[PDB]
Amino acid sequence: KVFGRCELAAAMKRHGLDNYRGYSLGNWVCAAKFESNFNTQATNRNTDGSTDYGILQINSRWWCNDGRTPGSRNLCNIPCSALLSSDITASVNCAKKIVSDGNGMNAWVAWRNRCKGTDVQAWIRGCRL
Numbered sequence: 001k002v003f004g005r006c007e008l009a010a011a012m013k014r015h016g017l018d019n020y021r022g023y024s025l026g027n028w029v030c031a032a033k034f035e036s037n038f039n040t041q042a043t044n045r046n047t048d049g050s051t052d053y054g055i056l057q058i059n060s061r062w063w064c065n066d067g068r069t070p071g072s073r074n075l076c077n078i079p080c081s082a083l084l085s086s087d088i089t090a091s092v093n094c095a096k097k098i099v100s101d102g103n104g105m106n107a108w109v110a111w112r113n114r115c116k117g118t119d120v121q122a123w124i125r126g127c128r129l
């Protein structure tokens with residue numbers, strides 16, 4: 001599934017991401033934009049044998065189990081396939097875990113490089129939230 005910005009902003013808000021650990025809603029929408037282009041099916045391979053999965057490109061090295069990332073962790077206690085669902089619930093809950101574990105949103109490369117210190121509110125303006 002591919003979200004529009006306002007659609008994703010609404011879903012994320014419903015899932016309690018707005019101001020989660022101090023990060024306003026637009027940060028989460030912006031991160032999803034540059035990580036996955038709002039695509040729940042997005043996957044990207046890493047040089048360490050891990051894979052980044054789903055709307056927020058959560059990786060199999062630390063956060064989920066894909067059965068093909070030797071020696072990795074599964075700190076969100078989920079199959080990586082759950083991060084590829086049309087329903088963003090697993091992705092959102094795992095992202096909360098990543099952030100609340102003390103990693104910040106800085107965990108997300110694309111967010112750090114393209115969202116942090118920008119007008120992230122642009123991502124939600126004009127939406128009917």
Ligand SMILES: O=S(=O)(O)c1cc2c(O)c(c1)Cc1cc(S(=O)(=O)O)cc(c1O)Cc1cc(S(=O)(=O)O)cc(c1O)Cc1cc(S(=O)(=O)O)cc(c1O)C2
Pocket residue numbers: 006007008010011012014015086087088
């Ligand atoms: O894209 S929109 O934000 O305009 C939208 C609004 C409503 C919708 O019903 C939908 C989209 C369709 C829809 C989408 C999704 S999602 O893309 O996966 O996020 C999920 C649902 C859904 O009907 C199912 C659903 C989930 C939840 S949740 O437990 O909070 O995630 C709540 C609802 C759902 O229908 C109720 C609901 C809340 C809201 S509100 O944003 O809280 O006002 C709007 C609409 C609702 O149907 C009314």
Ligand SMILES: O=S(=O)(O)c1cc2c(O)c(c1)Cc1cc(S(=O)(=O)O)cc(c1O)Cc1cc(S(=O)(=O)O)cc(c1O)Cc1cc(S(=O)(=O)O)cc(c1O)C2
Pocket residue numbers: 104105106112116117118
């Ligand atoms: O990720 S967070 O938004 O939670 C965060 C907030 C602050 C932080 O200090 C950091 C993270 C740590 C941090 C990370 C990095 S990174 O490697 O690029 O991820 C860089 C810095 C940093 O403190 C250094 C730094 C850079 C910049 S920049 O010119 O925009 O690149 C600004 C600042 C920095 O400390 C000041 C600053 C701005 C911001 S703001 O989000 O732009 O308002 C938050 C915090 C800040 O310390 C307060």
Ligand SMILES: [Cl-]
Pocket residue numbers: 024025026027120121122124
């Ligand atoms: Cl915002």
Ligand SMILES: [Mg+2]
Pocket residue numbers: 034035052057109110
């Ligand atoms: Mg990425």
Ligand code: NA
Pocket residue numbers: 060061062063064065066069072073074
């Ligand atoms: Na893993």
